[PDB]
Design an enzyme around this catalytic site. Sequence first.
Site, PDB file in Angstrom:
ATOM      1  N   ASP A 128       0.990  -1.224  -0.155  1.00  0.00           N
ATOM      2  CA  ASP A 128       0.170   0.200  -0.042  1.00  0.00           C
ATOM      3  C   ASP A 128       0.880   1.220   0.042  1.00  0.00           C
ATOM      4  O   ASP A 128       0.919   1.987   1.078  1.00  0.00           O
ATOM      5  CB  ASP A 128      -0.833  -0.017   1.177  1.00  0.00           C
ATOM      6  N   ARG A 132       0.282   9.153   1.262  1.00  0.00           N
ATOM      7  CA  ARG A 132      -0.298   8.912   2.505  1.00  0.00           C
ATOM      8  C   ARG A 132       0.238   7.951   3.614  1.00  0.00           C
ATOM      9  O   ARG A 132       0.085   7.875   5.011  1.00  0.00           O
ATOM     10  CB  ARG A 132      -1.862   8.527   2.268  1.00  0.00           C
ATOM     11  N   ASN A 133       1.273   7.127   3.346  1.00  0.00           N
ATOM     12  CA  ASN A 133       1.825   6.057   4.175  1.00  0.00           C
ATOM     13  C   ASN A 133       3.399   6.492   4.338  1.00  0.00           C
ATOM     14  O   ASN A 133       3.970   5.716   4.972  1.00  0.00           O
ATOM     15  CB  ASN A 133       1.767   4.815   3.199  1.00  0.00           C
ATOM     16  N   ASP A 146       3.727   2.015   7.113  1.00  0.00           N
ATOM     17  CA  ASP A 146       2.596   1.540   6.834  1.00  0.00           C
ATOM     18  C   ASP A 146       1.530   1.435   7.853  1.00  0.00           C
ATOM     19  O   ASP A 146       1.545   0.925   8.858  1.00  0.00           O
ATOM     20  CB  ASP A 146       2.742   0.174   6.432  1.00  0.00           C
TER      21      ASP A 146
HETATM   22  C1  LIG Z   1       3.135   3.707  15.929  1.00  0.00           C
HETATM   23  C2  LIG Z   1       3.283   2.975  14.524  1.00  0.00           C
HETATM   24  C3  LIG Z   1       3.274   1.639  14.737  1.00  0.00           C
HETATM   25  C4  LIG Z   1       3.541   0.658  13.554  1.00  0.00           C
HETATM   26  C5  LIG Z   1       3.625   1.372  12.511  1.00  0.00           C
HETATM   27  N1  LIG Z   1       4.121   0.139  11.471  1.00  0.00           N
HETATM   28  C6  LIG Z   1       4.710   0.738  10.137  1.00  0.00           C
HETATM   29  O1  LIG Z   1       5.008   1.696   9.780  1.00  0.00           O
HETATM   30  C7  LIG Z   1       5.088  -0.620   9.312  1.00  0.00           C
HETATM   31  C8  LIG Z   1       6.060  -0.293   8.240  1.00  0.00           C
HETATM   32  C9  LIG Z   1       6.375  -1.163   7.462  1.00  0.00           C
HETATM   33  C10 LIG Z   1       5.870  -2.567   7.492  1.00  0.00           C
HETATM   34  C11 LIG Z   1       6.577  -3.481   6.609  1.00  0.00           C
HETATM   35  N2  LIG Z   1       5.182  -4.461   6.149  1.00  0.00           N
HETATM   36  C12 LIG Z   1       5.808  -5.760   5.521  1.00  0.00           C
HETATM   37  C13 LIG Z   1       4.687  -6.409   4.942  1.00  0.00           C
HETATM   38  N3  LIG Z   1       3.684  -5.588   4.353  1.00  0.00           N
HETATM   39  C14 LIG Z   1       2.478  -6.802   3.887  1.00  0.00           C
HETATM   40  C15 LIG Z   1       3.091  -4.670   5.074  1.00  0.00           C
HETATM   41  C16 LIG Z   1       4.201  -3.514   5.470  1.00  0.00           C
HETATM   42  C17 LIG Z   1       4.936  -2.921   8.594  1.00  0.00           C
HETATM   43  C18 LIG Z   1       4.394  -1.652   9.414  1.00  0.00           C
HETATM   44  C19 LIG Z   1       4.321   2.672  12.343  1.00  0.00           C
HETATM   45  C20 LIG Z   1       3.805   3.536  13.370  1.00  0.00           C
HETATM   46  N4  LIG Z   1       4.415   4.958  13.084  1.00  0.00           N
HETATM   47  C21 LIG Z   1       3.047   5.729  13.088  1.00  0.00           C
HETATM   48  N5  LIG Z   1       1.990   5.165  12.886  1.00  0.00           N
HETATM   49  C22 LIG Z   1       0.755   6.320  12.827  1.00  0.00           C
HETATM   50  C23 LIG Z   1       1.280   7.778  12.756  1.00  0.00           C
HETATM   51  C24 LIG Z   1       2.479   8.161  12.861  1.00  0.00           C
HETATM   52  C25 LIG Z   1       2.876   9.484  13.029  1.00  0.00           C
HETATM   53  C26 LIG Z   1       1.947  10.604  12.641  1.00  0.00           C
HETATM   54  C27 LIG Z   1       2.565  11.846  12.786  1.00  0.00           C
HETATM   55  C28 LIG Z   1       3.858  12.150  13.148  1.00  0.00           C
HETATM   56  N6  LIG Z   1       4.634  11.080  13.616  1.00  0.00           N
HETATM   57  C29 LIG Z   1       4.259   9.981  13.566  1.00  0.00           C
HETATM   58  N7  LIG Z   1       3.429   6.905  13.076  1.00  0.00           N
END
Ligand SMILES: Cc1ccc(NC(=O)c2ccc(CN3CCN(C)CC3)cc2)cc1Nc1nccc(-c2cccnc2)n1
Length: 263
Positions: A128, A132-133, A146
């Site tokens: 995705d 936005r991500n 994500d």
């Molecule tokens: C708090 C948190 C918890 C979990 C995540 N997770 C991820 O960001 C992430 C990234 C890459 C993968 C890799 N993955 C591999 C498999 N495929 C299918 C999906 C992706 C998974 C999760 C991010 C965050 N960070 C986050 N989340 C929402 C908002 C914000 C934010 C907003 C404003 C300012 N600062 C931070 N920050």
Amino acid sequence: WEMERTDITMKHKLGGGQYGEVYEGVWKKYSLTVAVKTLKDTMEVEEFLKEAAVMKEIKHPNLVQLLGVCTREPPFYIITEFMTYGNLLDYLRECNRQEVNAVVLLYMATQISSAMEYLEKKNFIHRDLAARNCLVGENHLVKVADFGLSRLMTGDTYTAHAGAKFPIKWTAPESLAYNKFSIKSDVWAFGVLLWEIATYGMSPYPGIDLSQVYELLEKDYRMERPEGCPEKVYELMRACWQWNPSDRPSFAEIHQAFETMFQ
Ligand SMILES: Cc1ccc(NC(=O)c2ccc(CN3CCN(C)CC3)cc2)cc1Nc1nccc(-c2cccnc2)n1
């Protein structure tokens, strides 16, 4: 990665609850602003734990940084760095275009394609990829993230496909047609993300209804070069949008093309 719910103060929801159950918090230990993804309770415990596990496996300057999790006792947390400027889409719409000029747009694309070159090598699939991500920090630092936007998000961005929601206008044809996701459909979504960057966060395929997008891509319609977008960036976009997944360049390739350009 485990840590004390005593080392964390849960404050306000980030981005006005746009990110769902995600909270601005402080990591007391270091007087540090963090983001904390919580869990309700919902029968979503399965996918929340895969997520923490995945995050443990990945580390790169351009991927949002895991710092800790809280998954012995509920409430279940996941804890990352907090990025000052927030999500990339809004950043682009809201920015000073004299600051965020051509060179910056290019720098933004470079960093994302480096994050993706990394997931590629580790044989991960984002699934995705979209402005936005992405998150922005100081000095135009960009991280791919994500946030699980399918079921949160508010509008026609995601549309239903058999109990799942897909962002149609970011989704590779093979993924729309056959439910086939791979690093190559990530490459397709990156080409749309290129167009978001160049138009300063315009919506893709403007006014085109969702139900005609597939048919148009089949007939070889692609979005036009934005005003002011270097032709080589557009040629790159055009390669990400190759009908055949195997004709699409790799993020290694793309990152190299983008690294050269960055001049
Ligand atoms: C708090 C948190 C918890 C979990 C995540 N997770 C991820 O960001 C992430 C990234 C890459 C993968 C890799 N993955 C591999 C498999 N495929 C299918 C999906 C992706 C998974 C999760 C991010 C965050 N960070 C986050 N989340 C929402 C908002 C914000 C934010 C907003 C404003 C300012 N600062 C931070 N920050």
